[PDB]
């Protein structure tokens, strides 16, 4: 029955990600972020991405583990609040949900929405690859760049990471 499945997974992503960015307690935010990263990996995987979504799932998720470690270490309230606790938190969460359901309504019962661009309402099996007899598998050769042609780029990226390491050590050392 389903053919809008990337749009559907994107709606689940927008739900979890608005509830993420509505700022509850950051541990609930990280719950929202792991849900959002998982379904975003699902979006880019089911679009046709081979590995890069599972890659960013891994990387971005270990980053969220570090963010959990610091939000537990540094500062929490006497009682941490959840989405449905406060006036403002519940209000922003439900109005983000209302924007989501309202755009689903004004796409599914309409032709197009032009808030910033003419968005075409139908799922993205169009436009799409017409079965290229490749066997070179585009993302594999794509990340097989940065090494053959990518000379200067990995130089400045690794140099930025080395500078990042010495910068973090000297900021904590600056006492």
């Amino acid at each position: 029955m389903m053919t809008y499945i990337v749009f559907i997974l994107s709606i689940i992503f927008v739900m979890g990600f608005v509830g993420f960015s509505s700022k509850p307690s950051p541990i609930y935010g990280g719950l929202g972020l792991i849900v959002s990263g998982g379904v975003g990996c699902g979006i880019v995987l089911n679009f046709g991405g081979s590995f890069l979504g599972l890659m960013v799932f891994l990387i971005y998720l270990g980053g969220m583990m570090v963010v959990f470690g610091y939000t537990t270490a540094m500062a929490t309230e006497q009682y941490p609040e959840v989405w449905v606790s406060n006036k403002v938190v519940l209000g922003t969460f439900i109005t983000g949900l209302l924007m989501e359901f309202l755009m689903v309504y004004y796409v599914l019962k309409d032709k197009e929405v032009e808030i910033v661009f003419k968005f075409n309402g139908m799922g993205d099996w169009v436009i799409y690859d017409t079965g290229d007899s490749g066997f070179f598998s585009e993302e594999a050769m794509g990340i097989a760049a940065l090494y053959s042609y990518g000379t200067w780029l990995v130089i400045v990226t690794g140099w930025s990471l080395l500078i990042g390491v010495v910068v973090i050590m000297e900021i904590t050392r600056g006492n």
């Binding site: 994107s10 927008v14 991405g49 960013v56 971005y60 436009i127 990340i143 904590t172």
Partner: protein
């Protein structure tokens, strides 16, 4: 127009407004910066896969390694802020008065 682009731009704008308005936690501000990173990641990656422009799939890996080391820098700054105070609230930053 590939309708999924609408919801991803919607998620970007919501993550931006969440980055801008915030109650007390700078941790949550860094967290929304991480989310905005993810939004630009997914939009650029779906762009590159619609275009089959697979020579330049450098945008995802390099954008997120750089913005993640930015987030690491912010986390160390939050370590220093919570070291030289009790908490990391937006209040008790109102010194150095303009």
């Amino acid at each position: 127009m590939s309708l999924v682009y609408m919801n991803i731009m919607m998620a970007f704008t919501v993550s931006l407004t969440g980055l801008l308005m915030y109650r007390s936690h700078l941790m949550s501000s860094l967290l929304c910066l991480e989310g905005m990173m993810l939004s630009l990641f997914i939009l650029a990656t779906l762009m590159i896969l619609n275009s089959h422009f697979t020579l330049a799939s450098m945008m995802p890996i390099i954008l997120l390694v750089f913005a993640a080391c930015e987030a690491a820098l912010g986390l160390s700054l939050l370590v220093m802020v919570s070291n030289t105070y009790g908490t990391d609230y937006v209040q008790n930053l109102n010194l150095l008065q303009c």
